Amino acid sequence: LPKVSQSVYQMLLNEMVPLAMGIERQISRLKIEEHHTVDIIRSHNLIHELYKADEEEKEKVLARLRNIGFQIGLKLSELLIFSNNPNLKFKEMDLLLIMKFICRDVWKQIFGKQIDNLKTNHRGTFYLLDYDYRPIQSFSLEEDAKNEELKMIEPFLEIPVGIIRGVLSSLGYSSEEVICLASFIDRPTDRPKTAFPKGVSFHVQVT
Amino acid sequence: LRPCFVSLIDESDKPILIYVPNEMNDVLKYNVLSNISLDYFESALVEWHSLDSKPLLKSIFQLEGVSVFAMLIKQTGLKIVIGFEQKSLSGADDEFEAINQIFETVRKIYIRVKCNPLLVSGDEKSIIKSLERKFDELFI
Amino acid sequence: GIYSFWIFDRHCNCIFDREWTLASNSASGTINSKQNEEDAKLLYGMIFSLRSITQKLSKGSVKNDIRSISTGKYRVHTYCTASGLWFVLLSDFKQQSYTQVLQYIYSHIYVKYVSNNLLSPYDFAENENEMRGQGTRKITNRNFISVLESFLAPMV
């Protein structure tokens, strides 16, 4: 089956927060193609701008990026069901099977590693815990500016939330009974320390 | 093997497409047959596969000179119903496998059209047009 | 093992400085210190001048690049990429060449933690006025310094 280099794919997948800020600014470095000038804005400047622009601007950008992730998950789910063919039913036998399918297949196909353990309250919310979170393994600012790090990577954490929300959609529950939130509250408990210090937790609730 | 009609229905019993590969009022007959077949899925009369996690083809029934098979996609809830003539079936095992293969091609076409990254959110007319031209390309 | 490590870019501006001392791994590592700004421009002048000499008298159809330059005491190991990013390294002799080491640095430290590090910039000369050797925007990425020190710790 055909393949593509993982490096270029990860580079494209990281290149959504600069998209999300730049397109929003366009709705709201001069350069020539062949005869007409087009403005190009450097990618790294847009992450700074998204950090320090506005609360409503940030909310709009995050919603847009969540929509991108939703589309990715919605389109990917059908092909995964056609190929791997899990033992799920349409609406709900139990949410544990659905989340097990997501963990075993979706993260295997998108990222290079199976997502780690997951909590289960057995009635309400599910916590998906991921250690070292591949697409930001080489993301840093400064030796001292550590608190800025967590607050300014936060927009990058929306695309997997969108992916989970989309995969939940087209599988029964729609995007009105499902609320999902990402956070950095995870610790590197006992695994070897990687580049990035903090883990990722996906708090997803359905009803 | 030339199917008489191919019908696609979603979870919510909404027919996407009841295309017939063109007699003028046979569309009514085929659409009635599709409506009749729609209720067989939620019925204890027929035991669905539910084994090894593979879609299974079933000869759901035959009315008025149309042997009609159907497949249920338990994961998504999609429902394919396709009919054939009696005159064009010899009832061999290889024919059954071929019919399963044509069901697989239909499902492939449906998935590939739905995953088009220009469908806005739910514009049904575009889906009908795309599936219709694809089915014209295949069944010809 | 080694004595100091330098990184320049297309814009003739020194991007990284790391100076070592006696063979203790936790040496006097003054990173990006202003006190070595003087003895980096003339190193770049050496490398550019001898590179020009090498290209001028070259033959064939490859446009060769300088590999190493040895003085009486120390020697210089240099690796120049097509993107205009020079990796220089001062070291005592002790062994043939550091081409594999510099290639590994470029292909597993810089490329991983700077180019693929969208938080940080690239082509550090920004908006003119420092494109031609007059400026300082040296990298201070936590992962870059940490991993680089870990990699050069055995060799010193």
Added chain:
Amino acid sequence: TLDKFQLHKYFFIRRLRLLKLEDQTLTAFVGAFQLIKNFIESISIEYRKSVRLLEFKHYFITSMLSYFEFNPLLCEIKAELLMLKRDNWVQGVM
């Protein structure tokens, strides 16, 4: 044709006898309906060009209905079998 007809009949009756017993056991009823549906499809599909097919079919269905006579499932099976009988009656008379 004596090569395959009575062989089919004998195998079918032995199958419906030994495989399932009548009189309750709704799973047995479901499987019996499956068996008769497969058999009637098989005898209709590949004995075509037999001039007495439909005369056989109507009598076969109405005779086989007699066993389902003493719940919603049994009523639904009876209704489906009557529907097949009616459809073949129309296809012959027209």
